[PDB]
Every structure is written in C-alpha cells, then in structure tokens.
Design a protein around this nucleic acid. Structure first.
Ligand SMILES: [Mg+2]
Ligand SMILES: [Mg+2]
Ligand SMILES: [Mg+2]
Ligand SMILES: [Mg+2]
Length: 114
RNA sequence: GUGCUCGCUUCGGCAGCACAUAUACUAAAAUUGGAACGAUACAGAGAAGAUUAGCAUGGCCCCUGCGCAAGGAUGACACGCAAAUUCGUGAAGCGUU
C-alpha cells in the first residue's frame, strides 16, 4: 500500500501552479509499450534524435488518438473553469455597499485596513 | 505651293533640282455614378444635489482658418458580466479495491 500528500501554498508564480498541474496530468498518463514497439520496429535509429540530428517530415496521427488529447483538453478546461470558488450570497451580515462592485471594493478595503 | 533649270521649251503642259517634314486627353457627345448641413421630420447638450468655466488624452471622426495660432457644446465620440494563464483544505455521506 501507498501514501503521500501535497499541500497547497501561495500561487507564487503562475509557473508554480502550471507545474503542479503538469505533475498531476503527467502522473495520470499510462502508455502502451505495444504501440511503442510497433512504431519502433518501423523506424529504429530515427527514434533517438538529438535536437539537431534527425528528420522525418511529419508523423500523421490516427484520429482515435486525436480524440484522446481533445478529451483531456475538455477535462483540463473544466478543472480550470473552477479556479475561483465563489462564496454564497449571504445577506445575513450588515449591508453598507450600494452595488456588487462597491461590495467587493469594501471587501478589499477590509483586507488592507485592520 | 515657291523659285531655278540656258530642260523640253512653248510661253500650254510636263519634268528635274532645291526649299518646305508628322497636330491631337481626337468628341459638338454619349455615358456613368455622389454629394446640398436644404427641406422634412425625429432628435436634444461632461464632471457633482442644483447651475455653470474650462485645458487636455485616444483615433478608419471631422469642420472654419495662411496657420506649428485660435475656434467649433470643454467640437463630437470615448462605460451595464470593464474578470487573464491557475488551486487546495476541513468535515460528512454514499458506492468501490
Ligand atoms: Mg452636472
Ligand atoms: Mg479646442
Ligand atoms: Mg460655454
Ligand atoms: Mg474635446
């Protein structure tokens, strides 16, 4: 059995959050060594190109593949859509604001003047 | 067309020589399209409770002026989610290995 934890911190740079998300997505993927070997026995030495070494024009993908990336796109898009968790419209406390822009400005002022 | 051939050669012509060397958006048209700040009618003036001065910024907006001056309502126009890359706790319940 296995165990780990990862706590959230400051967004410090957009890079940090991006990196966390990449970690998760990367861990998810599971590759088929079948297709890997199939692709391998055709091309051989072309498999291991340096930045500058080797070249074959284009690798054309079966559509079924393309569907995988499209699906992952939609998933990540949703997960990103949920970035900001909204606090429910609570009327219970005292109202001094005149509109929602004013309500939010009063909230930002509450953070900076204690 | 002009003159001269000592040309025929009459005074008729013809010839020869010289001299002279290329205009033009071809149109009296026929077209074809857009404006007059004119009517017509609507329309109808920044800021802050009210009444009002203005100087700017921006640009597929101009107008009067010789203008790099000045003026034109401060010349006009310039506001409904002006939301952008990207999350995670704490508890509970349910179903699963
Ligand atoms: Mg006023
Ligand atoms: Mg002016
Ligand atoms: Mg005035
Ligand atoms: Mg102005």
């Amino acid at each position: 059995k296995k165990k780990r934890k990862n706590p959230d911190l400051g967004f410090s740079d957009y890079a940090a959050a991006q990196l966390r998300q990449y970690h998760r997505l990367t861990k998810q993927i599971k590759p088929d060594m079948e297709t890997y070997e199939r692709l391998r026995e055709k091309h051989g030495e072309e498999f291991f190109p340096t930045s500058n070494s080797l070249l074959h024009g284009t690798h054309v993908p079966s559509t079924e593949e393309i569907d995988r990336m499209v699906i992952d796109l939609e998933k990540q898009i949703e997960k990103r859509d949920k970035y900001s968790r909204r606090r429910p419209y609570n009327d219970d406390a005292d109202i001094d604001y005149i509109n929602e822009r004013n309500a939010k400005f009063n909230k930002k002022a509450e953070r900076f003047y204690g």
